[PDB]
Design a protein around this ligand. Structure first.
Ligand SMILES: O=c1ccn([C@@H]2O[C@H](COP(=O)(O)OP(=O)(O)C[C@H]3O[C@H](CO)[C@H](O)[C@H](O)[C@H]3O)[C@@H](O)[C@H]2O)c(=O)[nH]1
Ligand SMILES: O=c1ccn([C@@H]2O[C@H](COP(=O)(O)OP(=O)(O)C[C@H]3O[C@H](CO)[C@H](O)[C@H](O)[C@H]3O)[C@@H](O)[C@H]2O)c(=O)[nH]1
Ligand SMILES: CCCCCCCCO[C@@H]1O[C@H](CO)[C@H](O)C[C@H]1O[C@@H]1O[C@@H](C)[C@@H](O)[C@@H](O)[C@@H]1O
Ligand SMILES: CCCCCCCCO[C@@H]1O[C@H](CO)[C@H](O)C[C@H]1O[C@@H]1O[C@@H](C)[C@@H](O)[C@@H](O)[C@@H]1O
Ligand SMILES: [Mn+2]
Ligand SMILES: [Mn+2]
Lengths: 282, 282
């Protein structure tokens, strides 16, 4: 859509058609979406492309009740690793604005504290889609929506940006679809039969353009409201609905488990060259 | 951008993260564009996605002077293999409208004969960008621009569609960049130094959204006019300029040489599971 000026001259290694970047993993989905692993991207090319568009990335994070304790490490490590060099707007949703730590930000980065009422299962999807629609459309190009009980340990950058993305759940990337913990009751809007499903995406890291993220969160919120009216709560709450949405609306990139990992639970397997965004004990 | 309704339930093999589709070839570029090979896509998923948008594909082909002889086989084989099931509009540019063969088309497909003056090196880029701009924007979603001295032998479908694509030249996909026959004189707008270049794209098959194809063809036409004013003609004419454009504006998919092959010259190597669109003797 938007007019893109030419890239400057760059000197980098030639990609070789008869040499894969990675032979140990699937790097493209069957609907031709890249699956983002280390070794698949030249970050210099991508940084150029996204800086030439003056890209602004919004990051939403919820810190309600005791989870305000996680904000200091989350934000300080985001400053070290998340979209460095690009414009970033953090949106911290909290019931305790005074408990938000004072974190020093790099240039071109800003943080907004958005107070929410105390307490729900629907809160994140509702808030991203019903309350913040207009603000996000005016302020950022992409939205990234993550859990707070996390820290950045390595690069998370513009390689993730695309109209719509989900992230492979670290516990299920090697699982067959029948083993996925999708909602299996046909009475739920999140229902997925045992013979359907591409991947099990984790609810803790998804994103896309503002328009696509509002579409996803609106759809998930509406589906959760239908379930509530029908007296059913999906097995994994908003994650169950996110999985149903991404089954029916294929993401345009999929992030590998580099982007959502728990080292205490799962170690550091050979397939992960980097642990980028990792669980903190809760 | 445009609102996308949900995919229906579909039953197909689960993609497996720890099993690549292809281990013998590069299937994604370093800027995260898919490289389209057989085995990388589920055409049922893609057909659903593109049919749900009622996608219309325009195909431009030039048949000037003796090359009108190639139209019958080109069009009859396009009917068997090109975008079958989707809406197709062929645009045949010719100096001999009466020499266009009467080819029977499947439903949802149409052909327009567009007369051009007899005779130039710039003609295709000029015509696609200066003369047809308004018509294409109203009539089709994507444009596909190909040589006529060709036949379809196998499936060429919506897996190629994306905002901007080029095709790997069949003679150079295994070559190092210093061997690419880019324009090497710095006096040409098409100049690419020996340490730059991702791929050598062939001028005989490129495309994208109407907007991106008009951008590319406008840029190439303008650059060719500068060269003409400066008394220089690039070594491979519009192909040299196409290569310069796609170096500076990275394509969002790259087609493998399945999509542009010469079997008399190059045989049928192991890396090609299908020969889709192939040279006819000229
Ligand atoms: O008191 C709270 C509780 C939550 N939160 C917020 O919600 C996020 C998800 O919760 P959590 O990390 O516990 O679940 P995980 O197990 O890591 C994440 C998973 O489990 C959830 C239920 O606990 C849902 O099912 C979710 O959809 C799924 O991904 C948390 O990071 C906070 O940003 C908050 O601010 N205050
Ligand atoms: O008398 C003619 C001559 C051409 N054409 C039209 O132009 C197309 C390209 O030419 P050709 O296939 O000979 O070149 P190839 O070697 O297969 C294609 C290559 O060589 C070209 C010069 O001959 C350019 O450099 C081009 O950019 C490059 O890809 C041809 O398919 C016709 O649609 C026509 O209608 N009448
Ligand atoms: C010890 C806890 C075992 C958790 C293993 C599976 O992870 C859980 O998967 C659920 C879906 O089946 C849902 O996504 C919650 C998820 O648990 C979260 O993520 C894990 C990787 C751990 O970090 C865990 O502590 C966290 O609650
Ligand atoms: C016998 C001809 C040898 C041609 C080998 C290389 O192909 C040529 O590459 C040029 C760029 O260096 C330019 O793209 C023309 C291209 O030749 C065309 O494509 C070939 C695959 C053959 O089909 C050939 O007949 C055709 O002219
Ligand atoms: Mn969490
Ligand atoms: Mn040709």
């Amino acid at each position: 859509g938007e007019f893109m000026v030419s890239l400057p001259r760059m000197v980098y290694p030639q990609p070789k058609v008869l040499t894969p970047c990675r032979k140990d993993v699937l790097v493209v989905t069957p609907w031709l979406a890249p699956i983002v692993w280390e070794g698949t991207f030249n970050i210099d090319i991508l940084n150029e492309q996204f800086r030439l568009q003056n890209t602004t990335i919004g990051l939403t994070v919820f810190a309600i009740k005791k989870y305000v304790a996680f904000l200091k490490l989350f934000l300080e490590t985001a400053e070290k690793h998340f979209m460095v060099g690009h414009r970033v707007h953090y949106y911290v949703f909290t019931d305790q604005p005074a408990a938000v730590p004072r974190v020093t930000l790099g240039t071109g980065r800003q943080l907004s504290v958005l107070e929410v009422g105390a307490y729900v299962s629907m809160r994140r999807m509702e808030m991203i889609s019903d309350f913040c629609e207009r603000r996000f459309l005016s302020e950022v190009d992409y939205l990234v929506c993550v859990d707070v009980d996390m820290e950045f340990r390595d690069h998370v950058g513009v390689e993730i940006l695309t109209p719509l993305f989900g992230t492979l759940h670290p516990s299920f990337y090697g699982s067959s679809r029948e083993a996925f913990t999708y909602e299996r009751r046909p009475q739920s809007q999140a229902y997925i039969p045992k013979d359907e499903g591409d991947f099990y995406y984790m609810g803790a890291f998804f994103g896309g353009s503002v328009q696509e993220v509002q579409r996803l969160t609106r759809a998930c919120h509406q589906a959760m409201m239908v379930d509530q009216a029908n007296g059913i709560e999906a097995v994994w709450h908003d994650e169950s609905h996110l999985n149903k949405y991404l089954l029916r609306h294929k993401p345009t990139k999929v992030l590998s488990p580099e982007y959502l990992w728990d080292q205490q639970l799962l170690g550091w397997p050979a397939v992960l060259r980097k642990l980028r965004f990792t669980a903190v004990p809760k």
